[PDB]
Each structure stands twice: as structure tokens, then as C-alpha cells.
């Protein structure tokens, strides 16, 4: 089939987190924005309309929404208000998402395992891991 849609579509709620504060600190986020954003723990929604995929946070201070096609670079405005160039691709059934800005780079992997969606964020040496369940 084209089984990526069934694996990823839905509303996902955070259930665990490691080193996200560190990851945000590395990305440049300030001390107040980090703490609040880290507590916010928004649900994240994935939808699909043809070739166009959309990832939205539910309402949180610092709403976000991207809409993209696999392989096509696109401008994104992150939750900490960075203007980045993002490319997302499907490699192994993992969604790999690279953001470039100011000669810097961060990679965000999103993979299904069992009934769970695991999100790994890497910036320089600093690796964050967050796990989500269907809400
Ligand atoms: C929020 C944020 C801040 Cl303040 C700063 C830097 C990066 C951020 O986001 C990075 C980031 C964090 C995170 O928990 N997830 N969770 C998803 C997700 C989960 C399920 C379904 C679809 C997407 N995508 C991400 N990417």
C-alpha cells in the first residue's frame, strides 16, 4: 500500500521526555521560553491531504504548524520563532526532518514503534528523546 499515512496520522500526546531543556538551550532558546515550552507538553497532530503532510501543535503558547511535501525544502517558523529551511524525507519509514539556519543544523527523527511515536532531536552533541501515544 502506501502505509505511511496510517502509521502517522492522528493526535499524539506526550508521555515522556529526556534532555529537551538541553536541546532547546543548544538551539538558542532563552531561559524563560525554554522552561514554559517544556512544561507546555502540547498534543501534536498529523494530517495528510494528498501529497501534502501537515504537523500542528494543539493550542499552546507558541502555536506551530507546518505543511510540506517529502523531498521539498520549505520555510518553517519554529516554536521558538526561528526562520529555518526544512527538508523532510521518509527513510526506512522514519520521518527525517533537517532544519538549516545561520549555517546551523538540527535533525528531528519521528519513528513508529509498537503503539508509540518516538521523536529524537539532535543538535551538535545534544540529544533529546520524547515519546508520544495516541490521544
Ligand atoms: C517545541 C519546540 C521548541 Cl520550543 C524549540 C525547539 C524545537 C521544538 O520542537 C521540536 C520537536 C519536539 C517534539 O516533542 N516533537 N514532537 C513532534 C511530533 C510528535 C507527534 C506527531 C508529530 C510531531 N515533533 C516534534 N519536534
Q: Is 63 exposed, middle or buried (0-12, 13-18, 19+ CB in 10 A)?
A: exposed
Evaluate: CB of 29 within 6 angstroms of ligand 1. yes
Q: What span, in angstroms and rounded, lies between the C-alpha atoms of 106 and 97?
A: 8
Q: Whose CA is nearest to atom 3 of ligand 1?
A: 79
E-assigned strand segments in 19-103: 44-49, 52-57, 65-68, 74-77, 83-90, 95-101
| Closest residue by Cα to residue 106 from 17, 16, 24, 15 | 24
* Domains of the chain with bracketed CATH: 3-134 (2.40.128.20)
Among residues 16, 2, 11, the alpha carbon closest in space to that of 130 is found at: 16
Task: Kindly list the distances between the CA atom of residue 57 and the CA atoms of 4, 126, 134, in Å, as whole numbers in the listed order.
Answer: 20, 23, 14
The grid cell for 72 is 521539498
Rounded CA separation 79/2 (Å):
30
Cβ–ligand 1 distance for 45 under 6 Å, the answer no
Q: Which residues, 6 or more positions from 31, have their beta carbon under 8 angstroms from its beta carbon?
A: none
User: How was this one solved?
Assistant: X-ray
Residue 52 C-alpha cell reads as 501534502
β-partners of residue 53 are: 48, 68
Judge if the beta carbon of residue 24 lies within 6 A of ligand 1. yes
| Dihedral sign (CA 87, 76, 32, 95) | negative
CA 36/CA 56 separation, integer angstroms = 18
Separation in Å, CA 39 to CA 57, 116, 118: 14, 21, 18
C-beta atoms surrounding 119 within 10 Å: 20
How buried is 94 (Cβ within 10 angstroms: 0-12 exposed, 13-18 middle, 19+ buried)? middle
Residue 122 CA to residue 103 CA, distance in Å, equals: 15
Amino acid at each position: 500500500g502506501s502505509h505511511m499515512c496510517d502509521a502517522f496520522v492522528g493526535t499524539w500526546k506526550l508521555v515522556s521526555s529526556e534532555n529537551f531543556d538541553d536541546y532547546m538551550k543548544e538551539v538558542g532558546v532563552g531561559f524563560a521560553t525554554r522552561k514554559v515550552a517544556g512544561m507546555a507538553k502540547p498534543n501534536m497532530i498529523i494530517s495528510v491531504n494528498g501529497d501534502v503532510i501537515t504537523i500542528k501543535s494543539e493550542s499552546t503558547f507558541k502555536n506551530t504548524e507546518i505543511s510540506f511535501i517529502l523531498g521539498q525544502e520549505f520555510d518553517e517558523v519554529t516554536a521558538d520563532d526561528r526562520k529555518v529551511k526544512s527538508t523532510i524525507t521518509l527513510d526506512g519509514g522514519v520521518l527525517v526532518h533537517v532544519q538549516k539556519w545561520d549555517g546551523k543544523s538540527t535533525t528531528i527523527k519521528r519513528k513508529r514503534e509498537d503503539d508509540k511515536l518516538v521523536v529524537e532531536c539532535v543538535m551538535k552533541g545534544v540529544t533529546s528523546t520524547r515519546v508520544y501515544e495516541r490521544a
